[PDB]
Design a protein around this ligand. Structure first.
Ligand code: CPS
Ligand code: CPS
Ligand code: CPS
Ligand code: CPS
Ligand code: CPS
Ligand code: 5AD
Ligand code: MET
Ligand code: SF4
Ligand code: FES
Ligand code: CYN
Ligand code: FE2
Ligand code: H2S
Ligand code: H2S
Length: 347
């Protein structure tokens, strides 16, 4: 199909595998810009001009897993490990609420020390502040996810990473795509707003894999989708692999918006890392959420999922005002409420 025919089918919501594979395989600049324009317009029509701010506190870099791409993998001995205390986490969350954050995201390595009861206590304290709480702690038993929901957690971010089960198992040797999906379905059944999403440009990943990632996200109708390029980390087995391509990752964001028009889609930190200004571009091609770093020094510099992570050298209250300025220079508006998904039911 020509690029014009693909766009026509995308505008008519004819989301066949062939259409998605062709959209990802055409590299014509005119096609790409029309695709970005379509996703930008779909975003504006369904989710409006508000860009929702989710303040992230990366509260521990301890991890029991050994994912091949991740700088926090347990075999990396070239890393100072840290754990914030529950009081530090709660008071850091309070400072973010004082700065205007309406969602607090708690993210960590899979660190058993807090699980499940310390997390529940922290969540209860933060919920007293009248904000949304999102957890991103990895794979844990249903009993833990249930305790955290009863403590008040609203959302859970568990990126599916890759929908190809063979690749998933080789990159995440402790677990499987089957377990990852089971976790996501459990999270949805418990009432969380649930976030999935993948990396783009993983070693061995093909365009057919990316199409499957899109169809996976569409199949389960996730409330949030977090997408970013793979960035190789020197202290991992993938150190010598190529980084993911920014334009291809941006096309995945755009297609995700076109497929899931009312979903919440961040312009991820990784997008800001591989290309200067990458998050701002992504907010104009389908994304509607930004997640400023609210981890305090001296820990912020130690949460090294991939190298070059932006925000590391800024003062540690800098990132919320920075994204507020970003939203204004983009001609967008701050989110007024918690920014939960607002479903538009269609046909
Ligand atoms: C129109 C003006 C000035 C042309 C001139 O010098 N008169 C030129 C100067 C620099 C150009 C941008 C950069 O190239 C980066 C990027 C490359 C892509 O390929 C096309 C898009 C983009 C944003 C370009 C857009 C545009 O084309 C610019 C602003
Ligand atoms: C800012 C630059 C270059 C200026 C430009 O191409 N803008 C057209 C008007 C030209 N001007 C009126 C400024 C000069 C005319 C008088 S003059 O005689 O001086 O030429 C333009 C050129 C291509 C544009 C992107 C693409 O679309 C894809 C995508 C569409 C989304 O929806 C919004 C995001 C995104 C990334 C766009 C952003 C931005 O928009 C770009 C970079
Ligand atoms: C934390 C300290 C001390 C006072 C305090 O503890 N203040 C709690 C405010 C709680 N809220 C944010 C919920 C109020 C929102 C009311 S509002 O009318 O905005 O809806 C206060 C004093 C001055 C406040 C900044 C400035 O003002 C400029 C700017 C306004 C933006 O907008 C939000 C970001 C920013 C940087 C502000 C952040 C923060 O707040 C500051 C630092
Ligand atoms: C200038 C930098 C590379 C800097 C560098 O590292 N040198 C390159 C890397 C990725 C490029 C953008 C993407 O392709 C998406 C999009 C395609 C449109 O067609 C034109 C606009 C836009 C935003 C591109 C502009 C520009 O071209 C970028 C930012
Ligand atoms: C002190 C910091 C830096 C400056 C730079 C950009 C400013 C924000 C933007 O202007 C958009 C918006 C305008 C509203 O009027 C008031 C609220 C808000 C969020 C501003 C608050 C504050 O003033 C900011 C964060
Ligand atoms: C928290 C999210 O960080 C992403 N993540 C982890 N390691 C990398 C990397 N090297 N490059 C890009 N993204 C990564 C995963 O998608 C993970 O779920
Ligand atoms: C720090 S990676 C994100 C949180 C969790 N460890 C996961 O892999 O899903
Ligand atoms: S991706 Fe998450 S689970 Fe895997 S090593 Fe990194 S922190 Fe641990
Ligand atoms: S959030 Fe923008 S540079 Fe830190
Ligand atoms: C992540 N943003
Ligand atoms: Fe993220
Ligand atoms: S930042
Ligand atoms: S920013």
């Amino acid at each position: 199909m020509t690029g014009r025919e693909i766009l026509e089918k995308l505008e008519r919501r004819e989301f066949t595998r062939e259409v998605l594979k062709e959209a990802l395989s055409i590299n014509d600049r005119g096609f790409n810009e029309a695709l970005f324009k379509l996703a930008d317009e779909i975003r504006r029509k369904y989710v409006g001009d508000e860009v929702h701010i989710r303040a992230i506190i990366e509260f521990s870099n301890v991890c029991r897993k050994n994912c091949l791409y991740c700088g926090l993998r347990r075999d990396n001995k070239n890393l100072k490990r840290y754990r914030m205390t529950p009081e530090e986490i709660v008071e850091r969350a309070r400072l973010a609420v004082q700065f205007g954050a309406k969602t607090i995201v708690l993210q960590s390595g899979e660190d058993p020390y807090y699980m499940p009861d310390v997390i529940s206590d922290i969540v209860k304290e933060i919920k007293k502040m009248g904000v949304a709480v999102t957890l991103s702690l990895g794979e844990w038993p249903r009993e833990y996810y249930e305790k955290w929901k009863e403590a008040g957690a609203d959302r859970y971010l568990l990126r599916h990473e890759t929908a190809n089960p063979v690749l998933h198992r080789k990159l995440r040797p402790d677990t499987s795509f089957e377990n990852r999906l089971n976790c996501l379905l459990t999270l949805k059944e418990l009432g969380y707003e649930t976030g999935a999403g993948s990396m783009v440009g993983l070693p061995g990943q093909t365009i057919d894999d990316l199409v499957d990632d899109l169809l996976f996200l569409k199949e389960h109708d996730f409330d949030m989708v977090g997408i970013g390029p793979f960035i190789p980390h020197p202290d991992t087995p993938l150190a010598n692999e190529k980084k993911g391509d920014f334009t291809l990752t941006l096309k995945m964001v755009a297609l995700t918006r076109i497929l899931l028009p009312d979903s919440n889609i961040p312009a991820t930190t990784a997008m800001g890392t591989i290309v200067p200004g990458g998050r701002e571009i992504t907010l104009r091609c389908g994304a509607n959420v930004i997640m400023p770093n609210w981890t305090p020094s001296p820990y912020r510099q130690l949460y090294q999922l991939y190298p070059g992570k932006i925000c590391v050298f800024e003062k540690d209250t800098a990132c919320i005002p920075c994204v507020m300025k970003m939203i204004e220079l983009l001609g967008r508006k701050p989110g007024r409420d918690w920014g939960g998904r607002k479903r538009v039911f269609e046909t």
